[PDB]
Write a protein that binds this ligand. Structure first.
Ligand SMILES: O=C(O)c1cn(C2CC2)c2cc(N3CCNCC3)c(F)cc2c1=O
Length: 81
């Protein structure tokens, strides 16, 4: 699928970053601990499995926590609608 504007409403199944790195699941706390952007308390941003999302409305578009233990997050690569 494509993304509208900055992709805040994107609900597709892309689950890798721009470089191909697998995404970490939003509910997971490994390999990266995070107190923010958890599905338990954010019920409105579609924080589902390990899919690319944009809960903070970054102009750069949808992103995910990465499975690389050194690198916290990266943007994904989804075309503009
Ligand atoms: O406290 C935390 O766990 C985090 C706090 N922040 C904000 C900076 C204070 C984050 C910001 C991130 N970026 C997402 C993409 N748009 C820019 C901000 C991010 F990927 C993760 C976190 C955290 O885990």
């Amino acid at each position: 699928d494509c993304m509208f504007g900055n992709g805040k409403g994107y609900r597709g199944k892309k689950a890798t970053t721009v470089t191909g790195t697998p995404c970490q699941e939003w509910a997971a706390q490994e390999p990266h601990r995070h107190s923010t952007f958890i599905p338990g308390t954010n019920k409105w941003a579609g924080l589902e499995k390990n899919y690319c999302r944009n809960p903070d409305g970054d102009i750069n578009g949808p992103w995910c926590y990465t499975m690389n233990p050194r690198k916290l997050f990266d943007y994904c690569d989804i075309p503009l609608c």
